[PDB]
Amino acid sequence: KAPGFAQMLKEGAKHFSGLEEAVYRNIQACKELAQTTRTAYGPNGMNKMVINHLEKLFVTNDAATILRELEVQHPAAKMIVMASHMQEQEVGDGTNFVLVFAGALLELAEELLRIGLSVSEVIEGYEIACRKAHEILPNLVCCSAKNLRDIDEVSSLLRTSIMSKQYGNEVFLAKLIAQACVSIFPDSGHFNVDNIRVCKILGSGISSSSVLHGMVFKKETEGDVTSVKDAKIAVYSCPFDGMITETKGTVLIKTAEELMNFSKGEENLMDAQVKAIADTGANVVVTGGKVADMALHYANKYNIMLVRLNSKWDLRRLCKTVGATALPRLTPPVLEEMGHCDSVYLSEVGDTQVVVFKHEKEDGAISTIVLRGSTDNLMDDIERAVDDGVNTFKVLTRDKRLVPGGGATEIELAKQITSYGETCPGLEQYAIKKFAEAFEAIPRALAENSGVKANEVISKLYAVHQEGNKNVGLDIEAEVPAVKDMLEAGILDTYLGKYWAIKLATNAAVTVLRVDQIIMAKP
Amino acid sequence: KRESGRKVQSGNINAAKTIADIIRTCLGPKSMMKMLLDPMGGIVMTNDGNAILREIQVQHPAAKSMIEISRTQDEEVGDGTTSVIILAGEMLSVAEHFLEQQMHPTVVISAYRKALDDMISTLKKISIPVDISDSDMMLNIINSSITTKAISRWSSLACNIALDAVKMVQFEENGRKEIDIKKYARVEKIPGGIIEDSCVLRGVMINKDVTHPRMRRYIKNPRIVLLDSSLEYKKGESQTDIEITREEDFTRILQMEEEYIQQLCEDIIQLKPDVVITEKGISDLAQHYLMRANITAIRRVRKTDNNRIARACGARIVSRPEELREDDVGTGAGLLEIKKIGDEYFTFITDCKDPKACTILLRGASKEILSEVERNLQDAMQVCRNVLLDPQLVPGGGASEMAVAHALTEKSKAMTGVEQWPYRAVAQALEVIPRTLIQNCGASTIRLLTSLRAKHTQENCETWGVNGETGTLVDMKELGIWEPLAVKLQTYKTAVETAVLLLRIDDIVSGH
Amino acid sequence: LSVFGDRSTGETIRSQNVMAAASIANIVKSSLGPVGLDKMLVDDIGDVTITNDGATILKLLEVEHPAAKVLCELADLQDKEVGDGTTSVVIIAAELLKNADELVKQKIHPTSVISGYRLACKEAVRYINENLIVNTDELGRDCLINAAKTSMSSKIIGINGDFFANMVVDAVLAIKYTDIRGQPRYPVNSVNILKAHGRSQMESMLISGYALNCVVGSQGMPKRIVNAKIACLDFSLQKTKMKL
Amino acid sequence: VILLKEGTDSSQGIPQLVSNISACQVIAEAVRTTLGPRGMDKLIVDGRGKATISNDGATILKLLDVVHPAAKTLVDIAKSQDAEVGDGTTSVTLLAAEFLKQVKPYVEEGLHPQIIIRAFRTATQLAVNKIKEIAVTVKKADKVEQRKLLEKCAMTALSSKLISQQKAFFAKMVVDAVMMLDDLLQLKMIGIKKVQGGALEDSQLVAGVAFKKTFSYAGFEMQPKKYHNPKIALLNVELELKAEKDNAEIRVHTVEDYQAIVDAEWNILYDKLEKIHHSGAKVVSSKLPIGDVATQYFADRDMFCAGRVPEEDLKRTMMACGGSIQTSVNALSADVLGRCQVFEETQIGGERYNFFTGCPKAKTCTFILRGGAEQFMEETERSLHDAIMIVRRAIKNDSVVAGGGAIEMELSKYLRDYSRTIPGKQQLLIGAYAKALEIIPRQLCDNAGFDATNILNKLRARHAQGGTWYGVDINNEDIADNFEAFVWEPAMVRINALTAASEAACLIVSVDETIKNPR
Amino acid sequence: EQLAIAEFARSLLVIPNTLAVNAAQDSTDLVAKLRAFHNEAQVNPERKNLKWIGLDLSNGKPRDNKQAGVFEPTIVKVKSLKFATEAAITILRIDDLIKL
Numbered sequence A: 001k002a003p004g005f006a007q008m009l010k011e012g013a014k015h016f017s018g019l020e021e022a023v024y025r026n027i028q029a030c031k032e033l034a035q036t037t038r039t040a041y042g043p044n045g046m047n048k049m050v051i052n053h054l055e056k057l058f059v060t061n062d063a064a065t066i067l068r069e070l071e072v073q074h075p076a077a078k079m080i081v082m083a084s085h086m087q088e089q090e091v092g093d094g095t096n097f098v099l100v101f102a103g104a105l106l107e108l109a110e111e112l113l114r115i116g117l118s119v120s121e122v123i124e125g126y127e128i129a130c131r132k133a134h135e136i137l138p139n140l141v142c143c144s145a146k147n148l149r150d151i152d153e154v155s156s157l158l159r160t161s162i163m164s165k166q167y168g169n170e171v172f173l174a175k176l177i178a179q180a181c182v183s184i185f186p187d188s189g190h191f192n193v194d195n196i197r198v199c200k201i202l203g204s205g206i207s208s209s210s211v212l213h214g215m216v217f218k219k220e221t222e223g224d225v226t227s228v229k230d231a232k233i234a235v236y237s238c239p240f241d242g243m244i245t246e247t248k249g250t251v252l253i254k255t256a257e258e259l260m261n262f263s264k265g266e267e268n269l270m271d272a273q274v275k276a277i278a279d280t281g282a283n284v285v286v287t288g289g290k291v292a293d294m295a296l297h298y299a300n301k302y303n304i305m306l307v308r309l310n311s312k313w314d315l316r317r318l319c320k321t322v323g324a325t326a327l328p329r330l331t332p333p334v335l336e337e338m339g340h341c342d343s344v345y346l347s348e349v350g351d352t353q354v355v356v357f358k359h360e361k362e363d364g365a366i367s368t369i370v371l372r373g374s375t376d377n378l379m380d381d382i383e384r385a386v387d388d389g390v391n392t393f394k395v396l397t398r399d400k401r402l403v404p405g406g407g408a409t410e411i412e413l414a415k416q417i418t419s420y421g422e423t424c425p426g427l428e429q430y431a432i433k434k435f436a437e438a439f440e441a442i443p444r445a446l447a448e449n450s451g452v453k454a455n456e457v458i459s460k461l462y463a464v465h466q467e468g469n470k471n472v473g474l475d476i477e478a479e480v481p482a483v484k485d486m487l488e489a490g491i492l493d494t495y496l497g498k499y500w501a502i503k504l505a506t507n508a509a510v511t512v513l514r515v516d517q518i519i520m521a522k523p
Numbered sequence B: 001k002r003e004s005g006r007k008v009q010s011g012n013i014n015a016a017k018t019i020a021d022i023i024r025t026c027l028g029p030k031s032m033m034k035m036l037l038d039p040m041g042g043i044v045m046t047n048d049g050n051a052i053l054r055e056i057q058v059q060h061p062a063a064k065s066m067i068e069i070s071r072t073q074d075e076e077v078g079d080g081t082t083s084v085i086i087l088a089g090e091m092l093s094v095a096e097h098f099l100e101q102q103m104h105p106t107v108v109i110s111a112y113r114k115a116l117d118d119m120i121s122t123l124k125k126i127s128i129p130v131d132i133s134d135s136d137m138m139l140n141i142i143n144s145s146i147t148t149k150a151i152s153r154w155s156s157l158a159c160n161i162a163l164d165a166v167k168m169v170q171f172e173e174n175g176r177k178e179i180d181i182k183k184y185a186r187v188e189k190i191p192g193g194i195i196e197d198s199c200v201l202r203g204v205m206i207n208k209d210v211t212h213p214r215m216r217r218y219i220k221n222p223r224i225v226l227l228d229s230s231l232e233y234k235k236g237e238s239q240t241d242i243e244i245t246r247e248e249d250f251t252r253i254l255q256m257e258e259e260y261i262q263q264l265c266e267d268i269i270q271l272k273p274d275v276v277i278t279e280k281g282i283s284d285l286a287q288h289y290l291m292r293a294n295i296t297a298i299r300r301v302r303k304t305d306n307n308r309i310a311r312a313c314g315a316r317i318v319s320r321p322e323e324l325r326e327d328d329v330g331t332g333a334g335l336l337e338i339k340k341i342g343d344e345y346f347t348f349i350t351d352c353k354d355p356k357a358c359t360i361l362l363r364g365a366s367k368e369i370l371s372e373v374e375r376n377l378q379d380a381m382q383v384c385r386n387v388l389l390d391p392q393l394v395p396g397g398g399a400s401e402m403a404v405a406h407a408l409t410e411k412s413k414a415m416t417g418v419e420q421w422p423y424r425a426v427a428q429a430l431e432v433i434p435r436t437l438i439q440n441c442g443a444s445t446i447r448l449l450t451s452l453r454a455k456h457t458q459e460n461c462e463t464w465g466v467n468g469e470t471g472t473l474v475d476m477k478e479l480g481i482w483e484p485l486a487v488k489l490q491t492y493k494t495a496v497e498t499a500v501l502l503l504r505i506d507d508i509v510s511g512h
Numbered sequence C: 001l002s003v004f005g006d007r008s009t010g011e012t013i014r015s016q017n018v019m020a021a022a023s024i025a026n027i028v029k030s031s032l033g034p035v036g037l038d039k040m041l042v043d044d045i046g047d048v049t050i051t052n053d054g055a056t057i058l059k060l061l062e063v064e065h066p067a068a069k070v071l072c073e074l075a076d077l078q079d080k081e082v083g084d085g086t087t088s089v090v091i092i093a094a095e096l097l098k099n100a101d102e103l104v105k106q107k108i109h110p111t112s113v114i115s116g117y118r119l120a121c122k123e124a125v126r127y128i129n130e131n132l133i134v135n136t137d138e139l140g141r142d143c144l145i146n147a148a149k150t151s152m153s154s155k156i157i158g159i160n161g162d163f164f165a166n167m168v169v170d171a172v173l174a175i176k177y178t179d180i181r182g183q184p185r186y187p188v189n190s191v192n193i194l195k196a197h198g199r200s201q202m203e204s205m206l207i208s209g210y211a212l213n214c215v216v217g218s219q220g221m222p223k224r225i226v227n228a229k230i231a232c233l234d235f236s237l238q239k240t241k242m243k244l
Numbered sequence D: 001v002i003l004l005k006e007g008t009d010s011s012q013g014i015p016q017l018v019s020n021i022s023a024c025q026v027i028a029e030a031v032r033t034t035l036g037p038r039g040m041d042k043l044i045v046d047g048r049g050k051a052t053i054s055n056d057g058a059t060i061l062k063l064l065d066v067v068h069p070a071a072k073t074l075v076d077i078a079k080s081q082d083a084e085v086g087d088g089t090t091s092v093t094l095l096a097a098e099f100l101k102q103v104k105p106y107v108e109e110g111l112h113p114q115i116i117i118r119a120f121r122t123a124t125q126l127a128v129n130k131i132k133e134i135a136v137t138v139k140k141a142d143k144v145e146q147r148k149l150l151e152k153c154a155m156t157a158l159s160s161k162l163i164s165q166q167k168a169f170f171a172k173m174v175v176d177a178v179m180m181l182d183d184l185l186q187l188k189m190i191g192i193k194k195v196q197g198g199a200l201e202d203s204q205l206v207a208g209v210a211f212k213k214t215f216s217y218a219g220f221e222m223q224p225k226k227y228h229n230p231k232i233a234l235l236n237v238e239l240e241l242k243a244e245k246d247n248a249e250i251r252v253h254t255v256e257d258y259q260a261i262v263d264a265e266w267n268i269l270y271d272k273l274e275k276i277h278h279s280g281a282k283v284v285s286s287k288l289p290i291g292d293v294a295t296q297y298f299a300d301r302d303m304f305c306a307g308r309v310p311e312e313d314l315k316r317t318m319m320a321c322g323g324s325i326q327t328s329v330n331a332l333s334a335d336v337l338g339r340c341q342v343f344e345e346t347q348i349g350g351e352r353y354n355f356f357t358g359c360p361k362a363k364t365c366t367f368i369l370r371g372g373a374e375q376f377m378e379e380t381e382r383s384l385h386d387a388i389m390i391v392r393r394a395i396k397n398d399s400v401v402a403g404g405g406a407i408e409m410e411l412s413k414y415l416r417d418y419s420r421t422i423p424g425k426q427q428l429l430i431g432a433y434a435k436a437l438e439i440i441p442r443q444l445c446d447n448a449g450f451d452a453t454n455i456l457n458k459l460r461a462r463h464a465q466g467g468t469w470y471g472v473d474i475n476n477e478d479i480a481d482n483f484e485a486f487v488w489e490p491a492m493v494r495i496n497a498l499t500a501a502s503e504a505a506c507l508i509v510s511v512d513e514t515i516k517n518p519r
Numbered sequence E: 001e002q003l004a005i006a007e008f009a010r011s012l013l014v015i016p017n018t019l020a021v022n023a024a025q026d027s028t029d030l031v032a033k034l035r036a037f038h039n040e041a042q043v044n045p046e047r048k049n050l051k052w053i054g055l056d057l058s059n060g061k062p063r064d065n066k067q068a069g070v071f072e073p074t075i076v077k078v079k080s081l082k083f084a085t086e087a088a089i090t091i092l093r094i095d096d097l098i099k100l
């Protein structure tokens, strides 16, 4: 009826008017997404009480776990989540850097629109300041790596990735990842993140863990074969039991004399299926399902090493390692769906029998980090720290450039951008000045999580950078609000990880600010 | 009931921001009008900021404190009251440093009072001396208020009224150069005549009419007498009343009334005076013995107006009428005159010198024209007072605001500590005065204000102001938009003194 | 029951008495100290008085509650006893009630709280009097010069602190007189602080005597006299009158 | 119309922590009164309608199952307490919520939760080193044998009970039961059985496995009990003539096969009895009841049979005899048979009871109770289980500390004195950590019905003078030296309870936002 | 009466607590720096223990009152603790309310 809905004319979608500030609703959409991860940044950040959709409880503080479980529905806030998945590509750090800096970009952009600045002019000042931010970032590089492929160089530089993923394991996790990547580091240009597979066994704690070469499974060998150098690996996801035909196959039992005939016939058919693997020359059989007791007798008869893997995630790891495809039928004697491995043997680590899949005539790039833990909740948090620890050094196969962290490269970048924004004439000096103040929220998020007043830390950082004392970052202490040198403490992040993080967070401010209306459409 | 905490710190901010948002668009020569709705249906369309807030009732204690601090500022100087309430509302408007940063107000007050010292130091650097002896330079100062008025037809004669009034009140012998327009320059209105008839005389005028022709018309040597006691029936030390209802009481009272007044009137006519001036009233029978000596009767004069008469002639203030002596003489006065001006009688005790007092005589064709000149001349007298108090001008029209805000940015680069963040907020809050000038002109505000800051950075800060007529930026050395220094000194001082008072309030409680 | 009012007993009158008393402490919480914040005193007429002194706050604070009316009378027992201290009594006693209110919920009768408070108060005076300092160190040893220098730091006089602190230290020690049995106190009247234009603030001089701001007039009369007799009179040597 | 949550339950900030602190106290209130040996029991009924009466904190939290997220964090700590030390679920559940109660006003005033995390890691690390200094090793002190010392601690634990008059007899039996075991001590090895009737003096201690023997069928005047080396068979087969599972129904219309039909149904029973005769099992133990016909079979074949045995007592017999439980009868051979030296059918309490003595793997025992009621023997079983627990921990761990709140009031005094010498935010938090540790001597006075304020004010005055091992007494309504009264606890369980209560309190404080997925 | 005197000591801490929040400092650090210095005067009588430590609200750092000269009379300190406990006694003695 009269009066009609102003500007809402497309499928009843809520189109806010000019007084209702339709562009301001997208700013509040990315503000609520940034506020869930603002207090989660840093080593003093708070954990998140994760309740999964399969009714499983989790306590973790990873930035990727928050975005995957908290199902966002606002598509204006989905531009940063799609940019955070772009942050997961080509680097393994900066997922919180995208959510905080682009969230502080749009929060400072709302103060510019309240004066009366156009959205087409502010967005041109962000792309100007983004190109100016890409020039000072090579100039902020203090030191670089030594490129000697030793344990001491890797473990000293890995202390940044272990920080804020799992606090307290700074001395343990820095040496466990360091023993794995140095086996792939002679292979120049071949360091890959999928080569390092993580396995977890329920044990005592972190200090009982160890590093092994090749593919290591926690399940022991079901057979009595200890070591065999057979290349043919036939993986079967079906359980070892009686043969059920794909045809009709009606088995009739009436009296007890037919009970002993068909039970012996199932044992004879189980003997024929193990013999169907023995003629093709395959002495390595991995069983996906359960193994019967009579099938264990046929394993030691033909001297075939039988191992049982119940989990499907570890069975899929062998499909992309040796090329063996899991067959659902009861052991089909084919050769094309098999794998290739030089030697497989059974060994013990920490009084636990594990099976090793390594290669001696091939160079070898598969490594397995056997993790031990009492609780499965905290053990999964260390498992994600391995993936964010290896991907921290997967980018170091490129040009090794290191920048100081902890607000050292944040205030120094905010100082030189404001100097470029002060001398720049025209109305575009307002957007560059707010691009520098968006860089101050990340040391503000680091100081507020440590129980320290944020304005006292920022003025302490701007006093030492005005005198030229570079590489000064936040001192992690709730009682001491002072600062410390970052080159002496050992915090050095990646230059390429800081390059894509400012680039993707600025383009997230480009994509959201270009959208000023949301319309639902029917196909 | 009661309220404490951080809510009254935000409650006093929105109380002052609501007053500042009302009269924000009433700045400059393009000031927008405001419509007030009365309960009786009346509507006044006055755009004067002092007239808007006077006829608007407020209920907030912070909003009530906002009006009275500008009302006292209107009594000190006659210009700049609108710029006070605008600047006091803009300094408190950036509440991001007051609430979101969880900052105590003591950090803000230590940053605001430290910024107050940079207000006086910057205005003395962009100042310019004034040649006050030349009358052509004084005409270019007062002309900013005479435009769009009915007095603008006689600007050459109305400027001589205010300039001669401020120089007689100002005493160079005392050193501090005091000017008080309310006492020594009492303005009176006379109906009849024209605007050209209005001139300035060197004396004090009495608006008491002549009721009998037995008075002194033209006396070359006026013998004046001043007295404090009353001329009536003798009252006792008690609080009894006088009621005449019986014929026996009518004879006894009037015989005592005649015998005491004739005893009082014999002491003043023995010196052969010309005009009598009593502090209290004069009865009807007291004029009967006074008309036989042909003396002009002047009664009902205040004690404050009495000392202006004593400093005009040199007489002695005598407390009692029985204690008159020969020293109570007015030798040296010019002339005594009771000549009618437009069928109203006025007594003249003027002289040919400067007896530390003066008056302003206004004439006009109708009584509405009498009220038009007195509200324009009193606004013109306080502006020209600030020029003679200190001969220093500042570049007005937003040029002094951008020159001050430019000095605070370079000063904030060397100001370390936590207090540098509210120190930079005062520089952006002082930009609201050239911001509303472009918005009242109708041009693009941010397009012009950004180029305004670029002209204040590279070029000289004393030039490149805003013209509130065309809507563009002009040089302030070319046009006469110059403001006095003492007006702009007290404007930034009161805007800080308002912000130090509202931000320090942390509790509002009741109690009689 | 038919009575002439409403009756209420138990611990709910204990919790209502401490919430009405601690709310008065929040009126004098921020106004404590030399950096205390101002607070608005709204009158019934409509005007408001901006006071930050805590003694004038409790005098104008009118709360019609008997728990808050108890704290009104201690301001009259504070100025008549010594003259200072007033709001420090209020924040201490209200926090005494708030901690004792937690004891009522912890199954403690208030009789042990009352008898425990009087022994805690008497032992507080014992620990204070064992750690005092006698009134001395007037000359030669500073805790004075530096004592008045902190009060002088808020104004523009604090640029040269050592120059102006010596003018107030020797002036305080000059006005000392016992006058009763060896009391020595200091009078409410003090030195007369005059001003002049001596081209800078560094030309101040410590005159050991009273200075009158009057001019003698004529010059032929000599300005340096040696005799001791000083005449003071209030009647005018001018022409006198009976009454004004 | 475009929402970000659309049903997503999420909140953060300060009141999300206050909602998680107060939700932790509802789990502590479920086990607040169960602390102490004289604590109140809780009544929990399942979905079937069966009421469970127990005061153990491990059995209460396993049947609570609160769907709150912060309540689930106290469940796995009680699960890890059973694996780390073995018991102490009601001690770390009460101690975790009182850490959050004292810091609950400090969070609301604007203090960050991460500073309280740094204080809980500091004071607990000082509490580990403070326990090991006061802990004294008592192995051969004052030249007294350890058998006399183990009867002294069980005397105080069994005091103020039903058997408080005859506690001298019950203290000597709980020591010899653990002494009969190997070095691998376990509470599951020593079983407790109840026999109705008789006085308290008729309680006996079986060195082997004894069960209830509710077999009330026929079989008298034969089957001799005394056997030198019998073969212990553990079966699960029914040996009745007309059984509910073993029958034969063939429908023929010939009168010649009708004799063979009943004979074939008897041959199901007879061939199952003939396989036990070939295996040589002298004693027949079965879970299913045994009929009267099978009792006549072993009577002439010089063997014993006893059915209606519970499966819990059959597994204890398997661990004693060293054999294996076989369900069928054709697999019954010497690989699953057992052996013992003395087997006899006793008449204690008027009913028949069977027990083996002299097993090669005799690592299990049986305690026989006698009394006029089963609920008298039910509380005696739990009190004697508590008397075994104090004796067992004294043998494993020699370095012990004084219980009864003596180690809790001493840790509250040292951590208060350390907080006075530390400036910064660690003073008001560690000082609140010392006052939060006083809930163990306070709830011990609440559950015992004593004056909680009259004892605790005199207990802290005793610790201020120099008393390091003074605590509360469950018998007397005053304080006493728990080291002299043999109220002990090992230092390792007191350390592991503190690092579990501090870890459970740190996991609640470090959580600030709850993520819920709509599904 | 142990809890009566122990809560009397914590109730006296509101005087540096309100002074620390008016000095724009951290109240959990500035009050605790006062008690960290005053505890050392009672543990050992060595001169390395800081004694008579006052509160400088200007710089936000505790200093010695003997060097700064910050002194207060004894009769303003004695009668404050005397009047505040007698006022807290009278309100705590109220257990019933009667209105007419």
Ligand SMILES: Nc1ncnc2c1ncn2[C@@H]1O[C@H](COP(=O)(O)OP(=O)(O)OP(=O)(O)O)[C@@H](O)[C@H]1O
Residues within 6 Å of the ligand: A041, A042, A043, A062, A063, A064, A092, A093, A094, A095, A096, A097, A160, A161, A163, A164, A165, A388, A404, A405, A406, A407, A473, A474, A476, A491, A493
């Ligand atoms: N202990 C520390 N010292 C100095 N800087 C730190 C510390 N911890 C974190 N930072 C800063 O935090 C930023 C990265 O922190 P953080 O480890 O939280 O990111 P991240 O968790 O690795 O990202 P992702 O979620 O992708 O794993 C860097 O800029 C780094 O300088």
Ligand SMILES: Nc1ncnc2c1ncn2[C@@H]1O[C@H](COP(=O)(O)OP(=O)(O)OP(=O)(O)O)[C@@H](O)[C@H]1O
Residues within 6 Å of the ligand: B026, B027, B028, B029, B031, B049, B078, B079, B080, B081, B082, B083, B396, B397, B398, B437, B466, B467, B468, B469, B470, B481, B482, B483
């Ligand atoms: N053409 C113009 N363009 C821009 N600014 C101008 C122009 N003419 C005058 N001004 C400036 O505008 C100012 C007047 O502003 P505003 O109206 O806010 O104060 P006001 O009402 O005159 O003050 P008061 O109430 O004290 O009289 C003058 O001081 C003058 O410097």
Ligand SMILES: Nc1ncnc2c1ncn2[C@@H]1O[C@H](COP(=O)(O)OP(=O)(O)OP(=O)(O)O)[C@@H](O)[C@H]1O
Residues within 6 Å of the ligand: C031, C032, C033, C034, C036, C054, C055, C078, C083, C084, C085, C086, C087, C088, C089, E015, E019, E055, E056, E057, E070, E071
């Ligand atoms: N020189 C000083 N340095 C530091 N703190 C001071 C100094 N002088 C006073 N104080 C503090 O200021 C407080 C005094 O507050 P304020 O003067 O606002 O009210 P008050 O005097 O306590 O009220 P009342 O007059 O009833 O006693 C005292 O508690 C004292 O601790």
Ligand SMILES: Nc1ncnc2c1ncn2[C@@H]1O[C@H](COP(=O)(O)OP(=O)(O)OP(=O)(O)O)[C@@H](O)[C@H]1O
Residues within 6 Å of the ligand: D034, D035, D036, D037, D039, D087, D088, D089, D090, D091, D092, D156, D157, D403, D404, D405, D440, D444, D472, D473, D474, D487, D489
């Ligand atoms: N005989 C006793 N006399 C005095 N105090 C005792 C005695 N036995 C135990 N306590 C005290 O009771 C507390 C534990 O009570 P309770 O037995 O109810 O819990 P618990 O079962 O020991 O807990 P958990 O199973 O977690 O160890 C201990 O702190 C101990 O000091």
